[PDB]
Design an enzyme around this catalytic site. Structure first.
Site, PDB file in Angstrom:
ATOM      1  N   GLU A 126      57.027  28.613  44.805  1.00 54.25           N
ATOM      2  CA  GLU A 126      57.975  27.871  46.380  1.00 54.25           C
ATOM      3  C   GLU A 126      59.160  27.804  45.252  1.00 54.25           C
ATOM      4  O   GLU A 126      60.777  27.503  46.135  1.00 54.25           O
ATOM      5  CB  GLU A 126      57.256  26.441  46.000  1.00 54.25           C
ATOM      6  CG  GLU A 126      56.293  26.755  47.223  1.00 54.25           C
ATOM      7  CD  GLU A 126      56.294  26.813  48.306  1.00 54.25           C
ATOM      8  OE1 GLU A 126      55.259  26.597  48.967  1.00 54.25           O
ATOM      9  OE2 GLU A 126      57.229  27.067  49.135  1.00 54.25           O
ATOM     10  N   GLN A 186      46.418  46.610  40.037  1.00 54.15           N
ATOM     11  CA  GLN A 186      46.212  46.725  38.364  1.00 54.15           C
ATOM     12  C   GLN A 186      45.481  48.706  38.580  1.00 54.15           C
ATOM     13  O   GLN A 186      45.440  49.157  37.543  1.00 54.15           O
ATOM     14  CB  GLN A 186      45.764  46.123  37.290  1.00 54.15           C
ATOM     15  CG  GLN A 186      43.802  46.122  37.490  1.00 54.15           C
ATOM     16  CD  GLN A 186      43.181  45.395  37.041  1.00 54.15           C
ATOM     17  OE1 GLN A 186      43.667  43.894  36.721  1.00 54.15           O
ATOM     18  NE2 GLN A 186      43.334  45.746  36.679  1.00 54.15           N
ATOM     19  N   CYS A 215      44.571  44.217  32.915  1.00 59.82           N
ATOM     20  CA  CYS A 215      44.625  43.067  33.550  1.00 59.82           C
ATOM     21  C   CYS A 215      45.630  42.116  32.259  1.00 59.82           C
ATOM     22  O   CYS A 215      46.256  40.908  32.690  1.00 59.82           O
ATOM     23  CB  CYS A 215      43.584  42.229  33.862  1.00 59.82           C
ATOM     24  SG  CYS A 215      42.505  41.932  32.289  1.00 59.82           S
ATOM     25  N   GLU A 258      54.408  46.518  33.277  1.00 62.08           N
ATOM     26  CA  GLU A 258      53.193  46.505  33.110  1.00 62.08           C
ATOM     27  C   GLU A 258      52.649  48.057  32.060  1.00 62.08           C
ATOM     28  O   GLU A 258      51.786  47.381  30.991  1.00 62.08           O
ATOM     29  CB  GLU A 258      51.923  46.511  33.210  1.00 62.08           C
ATOM     30  CG  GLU A 258      51.705  45.138  34.287  1.00 62.08           C
ATOM     31  CD  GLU A 258      52.876  45.341  35.479  1.00 62.08           C
ATOM     32  OE1 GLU A 258      52.919  43.948  35.925  1.00 62.08           O
ATOM     33  OE2 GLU A 258      53.868  46.105  36.509  1.00 62.08           O
ATOM     34  N   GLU A 312      49.430  56.383  28.545  1.00 63.89           N
ATOM     35  CA  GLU A 312      50.645  57.532  28.105  1.00 63.89           C
ATOM     36  C   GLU A 312      51.102  56.928  26.712  1.00 63.89           C
ATOM     37  O   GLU A 312      50.524  55.521  25.860  1.00 63.89           O
ATOM     38  CB  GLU A 312      50.782  58.162  29.103  1.00 63.89           C
ATOM     39  CG  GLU A 312      50.628  58.494  30.705  1.00 63.89           C
ATOM     40  CD  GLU A 312      49.524  60.014  30.532  1.00 63.89           C
ATOM     41  OE1 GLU A 312      49.001  60.185  29.373  1.00 63.89           O
ATOM     42  OE2 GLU A 312      49.127  59.950  31.914  1.00 63.89           O
ATOM     43  N   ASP A 346      50.711  28.869  22.337  1.00 60.76           N
ATOM     44  CA  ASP A 346      48.898  28.650  22.697  1.00 60.76           C
ATOM     45  C   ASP A 346      49.128  26.759  23.227  1.00 60.76           C
ATOM     46  O   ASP A 346      49.137  26.380  22.171  1.00 60.76           O
ATOM     47  CB  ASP A 346      47.832  29.264  21.541  1.00 60.76           C
ATOM     48  CG  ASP A 346      48.396  30.736  21.844  1.00 60.76           C
ATOM     49  OD1 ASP A 346      49.349  30.823  22.043  1.00 60.76           O
ATOM     50  OD2 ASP A 346      47.697  31.297  20.494  1.00 60.76           O
ATOM     51  N   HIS A 354      38.457  38.374  31.495  1.00 62.54           N
ATOM     52  CA  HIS A 354      39.333  39.054  32.570  1.00 62.54           C
ATOM     53  C   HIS A 354      41.215  38.095  32.889  1.00 62.54           C
ATOM     54  O   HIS A 354      41.602  36.964  31.825  1.00 62.54           O
ATOM     55  CB  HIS A 354      39.166  39.195  33.968  1.00 62.54           C
ATOM     56  CG  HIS A 354      40.045  38.969  34.843  1.00 62.54           C
ATOM     57  ND1 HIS A 354      40.416  40.799  34.940  1.00 62.54           N
ATOM     58  CD2 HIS A 354      40.534  38.670  36.125  1.00 62.54           C
ATOM     59  CE1 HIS A 354      40.925  40.932  36.023  1.00 62.54           C
ATOM     60  NE2 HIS A 354      40.824  39.714  36.961  1.00 62.54           N
ATOM     61  N   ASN A 409      46.292  37.049  40.979  1.00 66.45           N
ATOM     62  CA  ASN A 409      44.827  37.919  40.242  1.00 66.45           C
ATOM     63  C   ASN A 409      45.946  39.664  40.092  1.00 66.45           C
ATOM     64  O   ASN A 409      46.703  39.936  40.790  1.00 66.45           O
ATOM     65  CB  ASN A 409      44.497  38.412  41.114  1.00 66.45           C
ATOM     66  CG  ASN A 409      42.665  39.223  40.457  1.00 66.45           C
ATOM     67  OD1 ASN A 409      43.089  39.348  39.196  1.00 66.45           O
ATOM     68  ND2 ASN A 409      41.700  39.059  40.616  1.00 66.45           N
TER      69      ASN A 409
HETATM   70  C1  LIG Z   1      40.949  42.920  32.785  1.00 63.73           C
HETATM   71  O1  LIG Z   1      40.115  42.160  33.270  1.00 63.73           O
HETATM   72  C2  LIG Z   1      40.787  44.155  33.850  1.00 63.73           C
HETATM   73  O2  LIG Z   1      41.706  44.853  33.814  1.00 63.73           O
HETATM   74  N1  LIG Z   1      40.015  44.162  34.905  1.00 63.73           N
HETATM   75  C3  LIG Z   1      40.193  45.247  35.869  1.00 63.73           C
HETATM   76  C4  LIG Z   1      39.704  46.246  35.128  1.00 63.73           C
HETATM   77  C5  LIG Z   1      39.103  47.959  36.443  1.00 63.73           C
HETATM   78  C6  LIG Z   1      39.241  48.887  35.559  1.00 63.73           C
HETATM   79  C7  LIG Z   1      38.267  48.809  34.176  1.00 63.73           C
HETATM   80  C8  LIG Z   1      37.968  47.582  33.696  1.00 63.73           C
HETATM   81  N2  LIG Z   1      38.667  46.414  34.557  1.00 63.73           N
HETATM   82  C9  LIG Z   1      40.603  43.303  31.572  1.00 63.73           C
HETATM   83  C10 LIG Z   1      39.321  44.941  31.589  1.00 63.73           C
HETATM   84  C11 LIG Z   1      38.893  45.032  30.450  1.00 63.73           C
HETATM   85  C12 LIG Z   1      38.568  46.281  29.453  1.00 63.73           C
HETATM   86  N3  LIG Z   1      40.705  42.710  30.697  1.00 63.73           N
HETATM   87  C13 LIG Z   1      40.742  42.414  29.302  1.00 63.73           C
HETATM   88  O3  LIG Z   1      41.538  42.907  29.067  1.00 63.73           O
HETATM   89  C14 LIG Z   1      40.902  41.386  28.688  1.00 63.73           C
HETATM   90  C15 LIG Z   1      41.379  40.162  29.090  1.00 63.73           C
HETATM   91  C16 LIG Z   1      41.332  38.800  27.498  1.00 63.73           C
HETATM   92  C17 LIG Z   1      42.566  38.224  28.189  1.00 63.73           C
HETATM   93  C18 LIG Z   1      40.074  38.513  27.929  1.00 63.73           C
HETATM   94  N4  LIG Z   1      40.824  41.597  26.641  1.00 63.73           N
HETATM   95  C19 LIG Z   1      39.488  42.580  26.079  1.00 63.73           C
HETATM   96  O4  LIG Z   1      38.610  42.975  26.923  1.00 63.73           O
HETATM   97  O5  LIG Z   1      39.698  42.978  24.763  1.00 63.73           O
HETATM   98  C20 LIG Z   1      39.177  43.546  24.901  1.00 63.73           C
HETATM   99  C21 LIG Z   1      39.777  44.110  23.145  1.00 63.73           C
HETATM  100  C22 LIG Z   1      39.264  44.136  21.864  1.00 63.73           C
HETATM  101  C23 LIG Z   1      39.414  44.016  20.540  1.00 63.73           C
HETATM  102  C24 LIG Z   1      40.870  44.457  20.468  1.00 63.73           C
HETATM  103  C25 LIG Z   1      41.972  43.990  21.773  1.00 63.73           C
HETATM  104  C26 LIG Z   1      41.439  43.797  23.387  1.00 63.73           C
END
Ligand SMILES: *[C@@](O)(C(=O)NCc1ccccn1)[C@H](CCC)NC(=O)[C@H](CC(C)C)NC(=O)OCc1ccccc1
Length: 220
Positions: free
Chosen positions: A9, A19, A25, A50, A96, A114, A163, A187
């Site tokens: 708002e 994404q 994410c 992004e 890329e 944090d 996530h 999301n």
């Molecule tokens: C995120 O949840 C996401 O993109 N979800 C949708 C999706 C689409 C396609 C494939 C997979 N998922 C994403 C997915 C993990 C690949 N989550 C993350 O990136 C999480 C986010 C944190 C804040 C919890 N991080 C993550 O898994 O980090 C892995 C990693 C390991 C070592 C060093 C750095 C990062």
């Protein structure tokens, strides 16, 4: 603190994005939080890239479509001295090589904060700062099929978050169980998911799905 907050708002929040089939994410959560702090500072809301984060913030610890962390993205924007706009560096949902171009940078930050790992501190931060990046446990059928109401999943973990998403406010509505408080969460799965792409996550229910365990925002 206020009982209801909704930064949409106040102009802090871009539309819901999608994404695609890239594990980015974390990058959408980070751009959302930085979109909000840049707006706070300049009064202009600009959608941020992004793809810039996915391709380029590996040196800060991120792993592209294989995952990342919002704090690493905030670090990148500071180290890199900028971040390109969404329009200049559009989203392709695949990793890329880095094509960052400082001429098209529209955002900066000088680090990040944090938040203490309590819902009380998350609440105070949302109420005063703006949208906040958070990590949640989204690994449950229930999360996929969410349509409305206050999301609560009894098997949700408060330490195993998978996530990244964006808290844009909080509020209340009467419910059967009288667990009436929620975080308002943007999301990155498009408008067709949930409530126009948003979910109301249970608030003050023992840090449900860990929403307060890894919360942070960029310093602008
Ligand atoms: C995120 O949840 C996401 O993109 N979800 C949708 C999706 C689409 C396609 C494939 C997979 N998922 C994403 C997915 C993990 C690949 N989550 C993350 O990136 C999480 C986010 C944190 C804040 C919890 N991080 C993550 O898994 O980090 C892995 C990693 C390991 C070592 C060093 C750095 C990062």
């Amino acid at each position: 603190a206020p009982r209801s907050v909704d930064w949409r708002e106040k102009g802090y929040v871009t539309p819901v994005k999608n994404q695609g089939q890239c594990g980015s994410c974390w990058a959408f959560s980070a751009t959302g939080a930085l979109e909000g702090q840049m707006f706070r500072k300049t009064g202009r809301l600009i959608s941020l890239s992004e793809q810039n984060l996915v391709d380029c913030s590996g040196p800060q610890g991120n792993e592209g479509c294989n995952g990342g962390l919002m704090d690493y993205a905030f670090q990148y924007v500071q180290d890199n001295g900028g971040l390109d706009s969404e329009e200049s560096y559009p989203y392709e949902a695949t990793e890329e090589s880095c094509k960052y171009n400082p001429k098209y940078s529209v955002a900066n930050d000088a680090g990040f904060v944090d938040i203490p790992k309590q819902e009380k501190a998350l609440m105070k931060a949302v109420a005063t700062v703006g949208p906040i990046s958070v990590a949640i446990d989204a690994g449950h059928e229930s999360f996929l099929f969410y349509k409305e109401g206050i999301y609560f999943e009894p098997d949700c973990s408060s330490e195993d978050m998978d996530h990244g998403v964006l808290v844009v406010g909080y509020g209340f509505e009467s419910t059967e169980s009288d667990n009436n408080k929620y975080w308002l969460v943007k999301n990155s799965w498009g408008e067709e998911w949930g409530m126009g792409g948003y979910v109301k996550m249970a608030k003050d229910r023992r840090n449900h799905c860990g929403i307060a365990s890894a919360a942070s925002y960029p310093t602008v």
